[PDB]
Design an enzyme around this catalytic site. Structure first.
Site, PDB file in Angstrom:
ATOM      1  N   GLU A  21      10.935  -2.878  -8.735  1.00 50.25           N
ATOM      2  CA  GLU A  21      10.158  -1.770  -9.282  1.00 50.25           C
ATOM      3  C   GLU A  21       9.091  -1.314  -8.298  1.00 50.25           C
ATOM      4  OE1 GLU A  21       8.796  -1.261 -13.328  1.00 50.25           O
ATOM      5  OE2 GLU A  21      10.021  -2.970 -13.968  1.00 50.25           O
ATOM      6  N   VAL A  22       9.133  -0.033  -7.942  1.00 51.19           N
ATOM      7  CA  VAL A  22       8.247   0.502  -6.914  1.00 51.19           C
ATOM      8  C   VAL A  22       7.468   1.726  -7.396  1.00 51.19           C
ATOM      9  CG1 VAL A  22       8.094   1.269  -4.524  1.00 51.19           C
ATOM     10  CG2 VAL A  22       9.941  -0.257  -5.219  1.00 51.19           C
ATOM     11  N   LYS A  37       5.103  -2.497  -4.782  1.00 50.39           N
ATOM     12  CA  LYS A  37       6.245  -3.176  -5.378  1.00 50.39           C
ATOM     13  C   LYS A  37       5.750  -4.213  -6.380  1.00 50.39           C
ATOM     14  CE  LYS A  37      10.708  -5.142  -3.981  1.00 50.39           C
ATOM     15  NZ  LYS A  37      11.368  -4.121  -3.122  1.00 50.39           N
ATOM     16  N   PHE A  83       2.489   4.166   2.290  1.00 51.30           N
ATOM     17  CA  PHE A  83       3.442   4.997   1.570  1.00 51.30           C
ATOM     18  C   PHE A  83       4.221   5.895   2.521  1.00 51.30           C
ATOM     19  CE2 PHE A  83       4.535   8.943  -0.699  1.00 51.30           C
ATOM     20  CZ  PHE A  83       5.358   8.425  -1.679  1.00 51.30           C
ATOM     21  N   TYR A  86       8.693  10.591   2.553  1.00 51.66           N
ATOM     22  CA  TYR A  86       9.953  11.253   2.219  1.00 51.66           C
ATOM     23  C   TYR A  86      11.021  10.346   1.616  1.00 51.66           C
ATOM     24  CZ  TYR A  86       8.073  15.122   4.937  1.00 51.66           C
ATOM     25  OH  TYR A  86       7.287  16.146   5.413  1.00 51.66           O
ATOM     26  N   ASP A 129      19.856  -6.688   4.655  1.00 49.18           N
ATOM     27  CA  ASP A 129      20.540  -5.449   4.303  1.00 49.18           C
ATOM     28  C   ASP A 129      20.022  -4.275   5.122  1.00 49.18           C
ATOM     29  OD1 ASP A 129      22.097  -3.511   3.122  1.00 49.18           O
ATOM     30  OD2 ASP A 129      20.955  -3.463   1.248  1.00 49.18           O
ATOM     31  N   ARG A 133      19.638   3.412   3.674  1.00 42.34           N
ATOM     32  CA  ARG A 133      18.945   3.357   2.395  1.00 42.34           C
ATOM     33  C   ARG A 133      17.684   2.515   2.489  1.00 42.34           C
ATOM     34  NH1 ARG A 133      23.577   1.048   1.894  1.00 42.34           N
ATOM     35  NH2 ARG A 133      23.772  -1.237   1.983  1.00 42.34           N
ATOM     36  N   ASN A 134      17.693   1.544   3.396  1.00 45.51           N
ATOM     37  CA  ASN A 134      16.563   0.643   3.548  1.00 45.51           C
ATOM     38  C   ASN A 134      15.765   0.970   4.801  1.00 45.51           C
ATOM     39  OD1 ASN A 134      17.369  -0.640   1.191  1.00 45.51           O
ATOM     40  ND2 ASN A 134      18.568  -2.192   2.283  1.00 45.51           N
ATOM     41  N   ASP A 147      10.832  -3.955   4.965  1.00 49.64           N
ATOM     42  CA  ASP A 147      10.719  -5.378   5.296  1.00 49.64           C
ATOM     43  C   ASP A 147      10.913  -6.363   4.143  1.00 49.64           C
ATOM     44  OD1 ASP A 147       8.159  -3.758   5.211  1.00 49.64           O
ATOM     45  OD2 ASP A 147       8.228  -4.159   7.366  1.00 49.64           O
TER      46      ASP A 147
END
Ligand SMILES: Cc1nc(Nc2ncc(C(=O)Nc3c(C)cccc3Cl)s2)cc(N2CCN(CCO)CC2)n1
Length: 269
Positions: A21-22, A37, A83, A86, A129, A133-134, A147
């Site tokens: 959850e972010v 997070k 933060f 985008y 991963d 996406r990361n 990270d």
């Protein structure tokens, strides 16, 4: 009992949820937008949450999402980072103006990522991963690797993932698929696939190909074709990352140097 990273949860106001959850929140003291997070007070992931926090304390690099503080005294546990405006690189690429985000920009993003990964290589970390996406994006095509997927190599060069763990097959090196073993070389493979994602402006890798067959195709020397408009040098680097033998893949130092020079050369033009 004393930690410099520990900050008072008071100084954070939550603004808006972003996923999971972010949250997007505000460090009020500094009037700064931050990412936070968190986790449910009923979870077994507390240990790994805290482990990753600890890891992120050791991490310091321009192209790695910067830890700002934590709240690990009572639930809900917070990890506060800078933060990234985008969001992730995949959606960014898919939604981007390609006249703005052009070839030299793609080169720039690849260079940044490879810088982060070279840093991790040096510091005996591996990313579990590594994918578009990361990777998160900020202004001026700033790219940073997320990270939370980091694991420290305490001994040797090989992290064994927990038994029966799911992993993104198309990003996952064949030795990781076959043996659940992740080296920095496995991350080099993953970075190859990420290069593909970048060059295609966020296409799904091995497109249309049934997952079940993927490994078997790689064993028989199948690799993804050079994307439209991808420079042959870059594609060559991609294939270098996709060497069957981990030992034959280049290091992130080599990769980063390559992209550094390529980027400077495109900058001249
Ligand atoms: C899900 C999401 N994240 C965003 N930015 C982030 N920056 C930093 C984040 C972060 O996770 N850091 C972190 C890491 C890396 C590890 C452990 C702990 C932490 Cl805290 S997440 C922006 C965003 N969007 C805004 C742009 N959109 C268009 C609408 O304007 C929609 C999507 N969406």
């Amino acid at each position: 009992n004393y930690d410099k990273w520990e900050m008072e949860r008071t100084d954070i106001t939550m603004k808006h949820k972003l996923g999971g959850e972010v949250y997007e929140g505000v460090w009020k003291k500094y009037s700064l937008t931050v990412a936070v997070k968190t986790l449910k007070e009923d979870t077994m992931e507390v240990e790994e949450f805290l482990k990753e926090a600890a890891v992120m304390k050791e991490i310091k690099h321009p192209n790695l999402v910067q830890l700002l503080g934590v709240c690990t005294r009572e639930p809900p546990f917070y990890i506060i980072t800078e933060f990234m405006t985008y969001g992730n690189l995949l959606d960014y690429l898919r939604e981007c103006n390609r006249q703005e985000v052009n070839a030299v920009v793609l080169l720039y993003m690849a260079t940044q990522i490879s810088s982060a990964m070279e840093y991790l290589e040096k510091k005996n970390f591996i990313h579990r991963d590594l994918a578009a996406r990361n990777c998160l994006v900020g202004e001026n095509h700033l790219v940073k690797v997320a990270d939370f997927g980091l694991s420290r190599l305490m001994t040797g060069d090989t992290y064994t993932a927990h038994a029966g763990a799911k992993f993104p097959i198309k990003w996952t090196a064949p030795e990781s698929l076959a043996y659940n073993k992740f080296s920095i070389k496995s991350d080099v493979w993953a970075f190859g696939v990420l290069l593909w994602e970048i060059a295609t402006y966020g296409m799904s890798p091995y497109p249309g190909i049934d997952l079940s067959q993927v490994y078997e195709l790689l064993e028989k020397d199948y690799r993804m074709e050079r994307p439209e408009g991808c420079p042959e040098k870059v594609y060559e680097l991609m294939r270098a990352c996709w060497q069957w033998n981990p030992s034959d893949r280049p290091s992130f130092a080599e990769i980063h140097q390559a992209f550094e020079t390529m980027f400077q050369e495109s900058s001249i033009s």
